[PDB]
Design a protein around this nucleic acid. Sequence first.
RNA 1: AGUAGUAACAAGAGCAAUGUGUCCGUCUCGCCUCUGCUUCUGCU
RNA 2: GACGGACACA
Lengths: 705, 249, 745
Amino acid sequence: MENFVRTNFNPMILERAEKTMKEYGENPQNEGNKFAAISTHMEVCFMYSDFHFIDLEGNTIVKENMLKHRFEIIEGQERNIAWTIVNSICNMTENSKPRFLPDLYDYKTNKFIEIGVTRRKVEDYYYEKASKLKGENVYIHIFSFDGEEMATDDEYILDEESRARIKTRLFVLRQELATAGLWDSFRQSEKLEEEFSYPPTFQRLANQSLPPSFKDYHQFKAYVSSFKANGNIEAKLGAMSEKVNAQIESFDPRTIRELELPEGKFCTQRSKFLLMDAMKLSVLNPAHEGEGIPMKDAKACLDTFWGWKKATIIKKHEKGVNTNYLMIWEQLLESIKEMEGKFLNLKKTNHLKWGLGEGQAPEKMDFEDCKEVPDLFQYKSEPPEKRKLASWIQSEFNKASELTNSNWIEFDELGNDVAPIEHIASRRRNFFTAEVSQCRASEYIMKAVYINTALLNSSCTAMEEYQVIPIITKCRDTSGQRRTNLYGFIIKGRSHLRNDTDVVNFISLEFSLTDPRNEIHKWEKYCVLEIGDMEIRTSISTIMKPVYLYVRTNGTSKIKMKWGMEMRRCLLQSLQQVESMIEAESAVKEKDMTEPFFRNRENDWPIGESPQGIEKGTIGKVCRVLLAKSVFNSIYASAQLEGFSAESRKLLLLIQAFRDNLDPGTFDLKGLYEAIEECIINDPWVLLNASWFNSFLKAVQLSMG
Amino acid sequence: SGMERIKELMEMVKNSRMREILTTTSVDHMAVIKKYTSGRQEKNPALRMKWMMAMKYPISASSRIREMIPEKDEDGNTLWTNTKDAGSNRVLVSPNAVTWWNRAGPVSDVVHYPRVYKMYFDRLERLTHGTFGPVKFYNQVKVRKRVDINPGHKDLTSREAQEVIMEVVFPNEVGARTLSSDAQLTITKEKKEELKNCKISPIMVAYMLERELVRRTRFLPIAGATSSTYVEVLHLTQGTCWEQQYTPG
Amino acid sequence: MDVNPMLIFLKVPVQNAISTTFPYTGDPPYSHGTGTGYTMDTVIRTHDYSSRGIWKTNSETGAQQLNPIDGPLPEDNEPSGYAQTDCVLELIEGLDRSHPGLFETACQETIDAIQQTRVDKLTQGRQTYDWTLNRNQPAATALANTIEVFRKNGYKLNESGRLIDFLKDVLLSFENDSMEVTTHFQKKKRIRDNHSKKMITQRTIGKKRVKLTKKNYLIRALTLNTMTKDAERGKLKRRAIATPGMQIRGFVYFVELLARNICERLEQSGLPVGGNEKKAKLANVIKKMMAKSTDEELSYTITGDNTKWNENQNPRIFLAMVLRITAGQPEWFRDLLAVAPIMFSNKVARLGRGYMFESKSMHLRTQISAENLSDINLRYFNEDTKKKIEKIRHLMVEGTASLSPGMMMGMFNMLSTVLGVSVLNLGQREILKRTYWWDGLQSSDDFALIINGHFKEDIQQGVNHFYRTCKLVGINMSQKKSYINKTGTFEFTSFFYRYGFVANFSMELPSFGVAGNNESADMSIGTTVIKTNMINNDLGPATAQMAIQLFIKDYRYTYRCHRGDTNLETRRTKSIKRLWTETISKAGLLVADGGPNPYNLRNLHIPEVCLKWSLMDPDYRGRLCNPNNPFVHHMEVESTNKSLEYDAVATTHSWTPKRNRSILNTNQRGILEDERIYQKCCQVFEKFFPSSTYRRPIGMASMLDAMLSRARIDARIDLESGRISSQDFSEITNTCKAIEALKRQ
RNA sequence: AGUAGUAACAAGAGCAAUGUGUCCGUCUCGCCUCUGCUUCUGCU
RNA sequence: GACGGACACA
Ligand SMILES: O=C(O)c1cn(CC2(n3ccc4cccnc43)CCCC2)cc(O)c1=O
Ligand SMILES: [Mg+2]
Ligand SMILES: [Mg+2]
Ligand SMILES: [Mg+2]
Ligand SMILES: [Mg+2]
Ligand SMILES: [Mg+2]
Ligand SMILES: [Mg+2]
């Protein structure tokens, strides 16, 4: 039973027996006779090893109380712990491992001992256990409740006194198993499944998880287990209404319409810096004290201009306080004049607090401390208002594709070329650098990298300050001389950025020669001041142009700063595309086509639309146009661009399958047009891309006339 | 030789919360409670390294640096500072201290890099003695197939090699399994001979043995030779429209 | 000339310039604020596509539950969740008939993996809903909190260490009438900021003990927490994702393992294969379906997508599928696998963080959580949220909405894949026996469907048969996102096939750049990314050299390690200049030490220390790879070989950056103490079991019993081999006796 | 105001990063908020 | 085995 075992055995033996049964996954109730047998086996294993010590010389002392035991007990230990013991013992000597866990290890004889306890015959249980342990260097020792032993070949390594004590204990346990009635079953037990049932709460949940013609989970399991299909699909398809269909509409791009672009006011400029309208103040071969430090470079570039006048507002930010912008420029100029040290931090004046949005957030409170407020309304979630496509963004993209006189990307050096493929790659890479490094889009790349790097370092190191950050690029000229360019300044606001989308407000103040009054819808967020006059010497006649300062509040976040710092990867997206075209022709002509693509001036790729029609350009123009495309995808990144590129890619692929004569079909072309035009809202670059798709569609239709 | 850790374990079991953990957590549940964490976790490590290297002390290191690296440089740069905490054994380190160690630290006579990373030196010896032919341009027909990126040992599978590694490095930890092949026995004997009195930590020895004996396979577009010495230079010998003739050393 | 890049498509085919259609150099869309609106949107849409089904009130949770299974057949092409049980069972039976022995093999492998799977498999997860905290936690933290609450309330089967015994504890825990859990509470304190001079609320996070009633505990155990998916490309609008708690994750793991074992042996499954193997599989099905053709036979591919895949799957259909797949198996195994569909049929979606509210007259904002949104009067919500709240009010239970239909985003990927593959399997010509037949490949909702036939009307009838069968089993093909053309070109999960798969390099653009681990690891990452993209994504050799140059430029900026002969000046230019001057062979200096870039195309697979090793000075090499490296971690030498530490192998550029786990105005010492005590216990365990970091040690004995047994056997072996005297041996054994006495007391 | 865009930031908890799959790299320490530590940002 | 990153779909 169990209380028989709890009364006849020790605490330690019973604890190890219950732990063994818990390890195998049973209780002292479901197998109670086996709990008694496990406690008996544990008792015999302990009585084999009690009071048996080994001296400081090497011979055994059979004591009765600084000596070490003669036996390691492996029975009763946990299984992985027992295998740790067995492996440690087998690696101390060089003996083989036993394939099963034994019961004991004798340090004197250095032998693994297996203890058996039987209720049948000691001879037959010995033969069966030696059949189990066939092929090991083990030593078996079988006891029975008859009072008999049998070891391996009767070469006993345990003394007769303790063996008599073990036999006396087992004989006494036999004569106590009969003084209650529990014995004739113990002689018949010699030598399991997996249960997983539902407790009643989960069974009531399982009855409510069915198709609605079933009430009990087991009824539905019996239905599913015996299901034979008998044309259920064909019958339901016969009964299903025939308005459920995927009717194919033939796709012909000669009959499809253009994308509807939205209406409203014109789209305005939303780049973080001035692009085509930007003006540089440069220093050639800079050698001033503190050269390399951005504010010293900014002061050296400001010294090259001598035409400052009193600044006046000439184009108002219609939503702002424009006198505050004028005061911000006066404060910035006076503070640059008198700055000490490496960095310039501005005093938090009222106009500068207004421009940076100080105190504009409502103060965050807990709702426990806020329930009695009578006018707590939810934050609004209005969609963006639509904008009309304006012609400035196409002009920007035309200027971004053009070559300048300066080298904007300085590539670091490479390891030396050994393989012929590395010489071929160097030959192609020098053409790629000759097209890509002087592009205006490369200047925009380096501008964005510098601005986002400086804004991130200032946002994380000077979180409380109003730091002045000069807009700097560095280039080499045609003759290889270094040049450092200042485009204006950025005044960073407070930057306690915790979320990824957390805005740091800043103010940009950017030099320009572009009069804003000639295209005023482009400059909606700006207050443009007139700050100077500068002599421009052309070939017609040198004149005095006004120098304007474009001032606006803008805002960026850490993910935007992170992606702005990584804008040189734009150079990969262009050139990998261009090289793949060079590789494709190289596969056809069976020779390297890099030098005929870059030397044979042919105008071989459609890239433009004049009033004379589709314009062709060289492979280098294609390099610069794809580069400007990647750069403008980075500068004007938005969810509108993501949705538009994804959904208009399908229409491009349907047009391609028509021109491949693969007979393309749609199931819902109007719904696809609605998915494309859902994304064309107010972003100028998305609007220009929708216009570009319409132009490509018209060119495709004209090539089928 | 065993008394230090048992005295430390006695000092920990003197604490009642540590005793409650150590007696109520099993070895299986220690894999759970080892990865326990409760603070907020920092994402975007590239952005964080971009703004952290603008700081003076982005590196954390052990307090033993305080005895090994001077506080200040010859140029005046402070090489380390104590942490914000009251009594931690930790410092905050400038990258100038890494540069200081590499230009003026103690010069060790023995280094362990060529032995541990011998596979990469074998790659480099095959490249340095490689022979380049001409580049031919034609359309490359690449079939995606399973090739070997690491050949492993010829006599073992990956699982046999992993059992060999557990036998060589951690022989009391293998549990109930046995090396069931004479190849496993011979390679275990040879590696146990090679690694006697090794000063390298056992996890590094295990990863070194993984780079030597364990085979890894990968699905790659293959145009020509599928042998493992050619799979490692696949970026060099084939492209979309070209083939670089190459024989490894 | 106005420049248009898309006119390059007039000359170059679209798949050959498809990288110009992926704007992946800019920042991806992120959401701002809460995801409660997207959660309510998904709940509204899921109940709207199933609205003609049967309403029931769950007797155990009180939730309103919508049953659309075997509802009315649809009459339009709108998304429907009215899946028919018999049509699902016919398709699964036909999939079994077409693959004899597949279900038995996959079920027996699932049976072999159930008996061997440990509990800590559930620590494979990421952010898990923690029901003890009503909040998200890491997966190991949520599992440890669940196991601790289970053992405090008398559920101790999971002490065996097997996952199935933890799952038995999970199911038995629903009989508890009052669960006592440890929660976090904050004490608030108004102090002044010493820097900004401003009264701010200071927060201290403690531990509290609360009781959960049986219904509230059952609602929390069936809760999926929700949030917005950030950095998702190709969408104008956002959507919610879901995370389940630990009471669900163990069952979903076994169901998805059975479905993975099925999907791995189906020719028409695109899961679990991926990458180059998925491209090989798609190419094989294209070549097979363009072989099996006469001269009079047309082939057409549908580039297909499905509308609202997770919202139209149903847990009751998944229950029928799992019971059909496991027909003839042991009933413990069938009942164990049936738990996860039953739990998803009774799932509630936690609405999320709530909304932000604003007083203009008091100039304050406050977040109102999803528990408190039911008591807010309707007029304070904006117009769209008032519409959402009104049609959700009968579903709201305890800050969660009831959501019986739908499976939520990605919870049963392989099983819904199996359903789609059963519809693809239906179109074998020997079985269908008509003028059309079909074939293809499915992974999640994405599918390629190749329809063959003699005439174009046969293609139309086959497309209709496939589409209406999918409608019968709750699968709604997106008509505005799918298109069809002759076989030869298609798209499958941004893999573009144009008589062969073309490269799409732009998808790999966010992986170029400095990874931010340390100097050495980032150097290996950068050159390996360039090598892998040369092999796989057809990055040409000139662009690969330019990628090497751009990576080295970004790397030299980031770690401020420009070359030693630079005219630049950083915080470490002077030390690098000193190293540059005294070094004899500067070509052996690493890039992080101001040395040159060694990499070209031929040596991208060789690490930087090995590539520069023969050009190093001996003094620089002895310093850089010094085994007394103070920047890396040093393991203590064990007891089977101030204190002895192992020699280091890594260079001094393998440093670790400092960490910042701190929260604004928050004191979290009282909850960060448990992690530190855990790490001390796991550190003292590895002094006795040195392979514990290499391979996870198994065992049912406690950590202390294991350590004492190892200590005793280690002392005995070291005494038998003459490493310790008898005095040290008796000292260790008396120490183990004293530890056992302190354990008993 | 501005960023932005279905809900936020505009300082005062970051209490909001799932599932499944492919590829790639690394290797046990760190982390802590009234303060206690640092004042940093230079891409020819 | 653990941690991290990139991509895809849900
Ligand atoms: O497991 C051993 O080491 C071992 C087991 N028995 C069998 C018994 N036994 C003890 C624990 C146990 C667990 C599962 C199945 N039978 C088990 C002992 C009494 C009842 C049966 C006999 C020996 O002589 C041994 O050496
Ligand atoms: Mg035994
Ligand atoms: Mg025995
Ligand atoms: Mg879909
Ligand atoms: Mg899809
Ligand atoms: Mg506004
Ligand atoms: Mg990842």
